Write an enzyme that holds these catalytic residues in place. Structure first.
Site, mmCIF file in Angstrom:
data_model
loop_
_atom_site.group_PDB
_atom_site.id
_atom_site.type_symbol
_atom_site.label_atom_id
_atom_site.label_comp_id
_atom_site.label_asym_id
_atom_site.label_seq_id
_atom_site.Cartn_x
_atom_site.Cartn_y
_atom_site.Cartn_z
ATOM 1 C CE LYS A 157 -4.091 -1.548 2.486
ATOM 2 N NZ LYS A 157 -4.980 -0.935 1.463
ATOM 3 N NE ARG A 199 -8.407 3.723 0.609
ATOM 4 C CZ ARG A 199 -8.779 2.608 1.237
ATOM 5 N NH1 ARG A 199 -9.916 1.985 0.933
ATOM 6 N NH2 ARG A 199 -7.999 2.107 2.174
ATOM 7 C CB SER A 257 -8.447 -4.736 -0.920
ATOM 8 O OG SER A 257 -9.359 -4.906 0.155
ATOM 9 N N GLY A 258 -6.722 -4.448 1.962
ATOM 10 C CA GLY A 258 -6.385 -5.150 3.192
ATOM 11 C C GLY A 258 -7.394 -6.263 3.429
ATOM 12 C CG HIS A 259 -11.914 -5.810 4.144
ATOM 13 N ND1 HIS A 259 -11.451 -4.749 4.901
ATOM 14 C CD2 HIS A 259 -13.132 -6.116 4.624
ATOM 15 C CE1 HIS A 259 -12.360 -4.424 5.801
ATOM 16 N NE2 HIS A 259 -13.401 -5.236 5.658
ATOM 17 N NE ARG A 300 -13.197 -2.835 2.474
ATOM 18 C CZ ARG A 300 -13.686 -2.216 3.542
ATOM 19 N NH1 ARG A 300 -14.889 -2.528 4.019
ATOM 20 N NH2 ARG A 300 -12.954 -1.318 4.164
ATOM 21 C CG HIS A 318 -10.330 -1.383 -1.664
ATOM 22 N ND1 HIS A 318 -9.091 -0.769 -1.652
ATOM 23 C CD2 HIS A 318 -10.567 -1.770 -0.394
ATOM 24 C CE1 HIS A 318 -8.612 -0.769 -0.423
ATOM 25 N NE2 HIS A 318 -9.477 -1.374 0.373
#
Ligand code: VO4
EC number: 1.11.1.10
Length: 576
Positions: free
Chosen positions: A351, A358, A400-402, A488, A494
């Site tokens: 990231k 974004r 994306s962290g998710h 997301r 995202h």
């Protein structure tokens, strides 16, 4: 001294906490949600995952030290010359329940207690004493509710605390989330403070909330992924350049379609340009867990789901007195939570390496009259249990962290249950189904408030709009992984590629890099049964093909950890 914050009931059989391994995971989850409600330590995605990874590693070695495993071995060995990595020895200590208790209580105490050890300057210095006191209530309470009790005099209990000390000293990252020194560099494709929350006013002194306030621009853990000690990974992990940057700057059609899709699928409810469906709005909010009051972070939900999977697919019916079950959970949760931790490290490393913008800003600041929308609004990350408007998490978009957390977590579950729950090829759809799974984002209790959250009152006594209660059934971990990632996109936070290569999740058309849309103009996704995370890309700074998006990164991270059997990241390869 403090008024205990009233926590809402958890949707889960009370039978789960009769097993002491699940019990301590639970306390870890309670601390997770409470620190995000009072603003204490280990807040945010990457670090909240680490806290769970450290808790389960300590629980792991303390238990398997007293009840040695057949296949694998303890993460750390008692015979290692390197002190930092030397596991304490039992020496007659033989009470597994008490060793786990001591290890879980010590680790959790060390992690969440007021750092009286002096070294607390700048690390996270902005936590009031109430925050600390609220977390202490959770800790003290937990000793009392532990199935079987807690005997602090027990040698096994003491051995456990010894185990926790080693893991804490080795893996704790006190100043990991330091934002100090980082400032955005505006420009095309560049991350900067989001337009709906450009700056925040925070009290000058945390122990003086109604006193003065000061402007604050938040950048979440910009140096973490690049400097922190990895847990069990055995190599550095990298992603391809995102469309528009470096080696992929010529992926103009892909980028532009990503903009179109972003707008139609992630816009605010009432916008004419929003083509997302009510059900798709549900899939997006279901997986949120965006550091909200009484809810916490994604790692908390992933664990809630994994607890459900563990009980459903356990070997013995007895949750209370089964060593087989205790061994199964200690192993599983250590694997899943260590994978989650490393997923968090690498997604954060990428990231801040790419610093990609974004969608809210990429859409507003596009600059092209026929492509951008300088006034677009996303459905946004939900600020649940507050009266605040949706937001864009304070960090870059790619990956994306998710998606990474989900790839790691669910690929781990699959590797672990293959052959037990069903049979499938390592990288193909599994059989791991669950039902009666409720997200705290949509449980008929939590809500979007009409006034500021009142920490002294139960959420049900607070006016606001209640989140519809949705009970879900899932066919597999592949579906869980897939939906968590596309959630997301529906929230508009995202870009498609932050999740995975568009080519792997979208339905192609005859036009290159442009995917299928229905009549109302909504994006059509591939069936979960058909999804294969196979599309790679190039990097400017490195040779070869690399995965695209968070999902493949997480899968890759889980496979590596599992194939190596949960073994430390060799120190020679730790950041220095
Ligand atoms: O980390 V996100 O990076 O999915 O809002």
């Amino acid at each position: 001294s403090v008024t205990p914050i009233p926590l809402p009931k958890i949707d889960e059989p009370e039978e789960y906490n009769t097993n002491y391994i699940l019990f301590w995971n639970h306390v870890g989850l309670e601390l997770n949600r409470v620190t995000h409600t009072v603003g204490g330590p280990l807040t945010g995605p990457p670090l909240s995952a680490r806290a769970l990874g450290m808790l389960h590693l300590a629980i792991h070695d303390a238990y398997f030290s007293i009840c040695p495993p057949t296949d694998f071995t303890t993460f750390l060995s008692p015979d290692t010359e390197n002190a930092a990595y030397r596991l304490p020895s039992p020496n007659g200590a033989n009470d597994a329940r008490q060793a786990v208790a001591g290890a879980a209580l010590k680790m959790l105490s060390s992690l969440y207690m007021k750092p009286v050890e002096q070294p607390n300057p700048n690390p996270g210095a902005n936590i009031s004493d109430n925050a600390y006191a609220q977390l202490g209530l959770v800790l003290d309470r937990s000793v009392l509710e532990a199935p079987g009790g807690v005997d602090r005099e027990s040698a096994s209990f003491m051995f456990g605390e010894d185990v926790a000390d080693v893991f804490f000293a080795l893996l704790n990252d006190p100043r990991g989330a330091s934002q100090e020194g980082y400032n955005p560099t505006p420009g095309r494709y560049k991350f900067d403070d989001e337009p709906t929350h450009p700056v925040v006013l925070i009290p000058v002194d945390p122990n003086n909330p109604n006193g003065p306030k000061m402007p604050f621009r938040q950048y979440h853990a910009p140096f973490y992924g690049k400097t922190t000690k990895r847990f069990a990974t055995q190599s550095e992990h990298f992603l391809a350049d995102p469309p528009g940057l470096r080696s992929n700057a010529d992926e103009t059609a892909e980028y532009d379609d990503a903009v179109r899709v972003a707008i139609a699928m992630g816009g605010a409810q009432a916008l004419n340009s929003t083509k997302r469906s009510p059900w798709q709005t549900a899939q997006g909010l279901y997986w949120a867990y965006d550091g909200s009051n009484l809810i916490g972070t994604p790692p908390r939900f992933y664990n809630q789901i994994v607890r459900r999977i563990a009980v459903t697919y356990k070997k013995e019916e007895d949750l209370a007195n089964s060593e087989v079950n205790n061994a199964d959970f200690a192993r599983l949760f250590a694997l899943v939570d260590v994978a989650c931790t490393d997923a968090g490290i690498f997604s954060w490393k990428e990231k801040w390496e790419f610093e990609f913008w974004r969608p809210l800003s990429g859409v507003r600041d596009d600059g092209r009259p026929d492509h951008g929308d300088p006034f677009w609004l996303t459905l946004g990350a939900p600020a649940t249990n507050t009266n605040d408007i949706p937001f864009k998490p304070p960090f870059p978009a790619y990956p994306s962290g998710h998606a990474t957390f989900g790839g790691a977590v669910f690929q781990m579950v699959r590797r672990y249950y293959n052959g037990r729950v069903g049979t499938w090829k390592d990288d193909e759809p599994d059989n791991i189904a669950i039902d009666m799974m409720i997200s705290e984002e949509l449980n008929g209790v939590n809500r979007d408030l009409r006034q500021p959250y009142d920490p002294t009152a139960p959420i049900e006594d607070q006016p606001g709009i209640v989140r519809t209660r949705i009970v879900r059934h899932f066919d597999s971990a592949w579906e869980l992984m897939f939906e968590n990632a596309i959630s997301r996109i529906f929230l508009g936070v995202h870009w498609r590629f932050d999740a995975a290569a568009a080519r792997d999740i979208l339905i192609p058309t005859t036009t290159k890099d442009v995917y299928a849309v229905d009549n109302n103009g909504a994006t059509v996704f591939q069936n979960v049964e058909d999804i294969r995370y196979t599309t790679r890309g190039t990097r400017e700074d490195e040779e070869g093909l690399f995965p695209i998006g968070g999902v493949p990164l997480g899968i890759e991270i889980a496979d590596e950890i599992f194939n190596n059997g949960l073994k430390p990241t060799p120190p020679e390869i730790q950041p220095m």
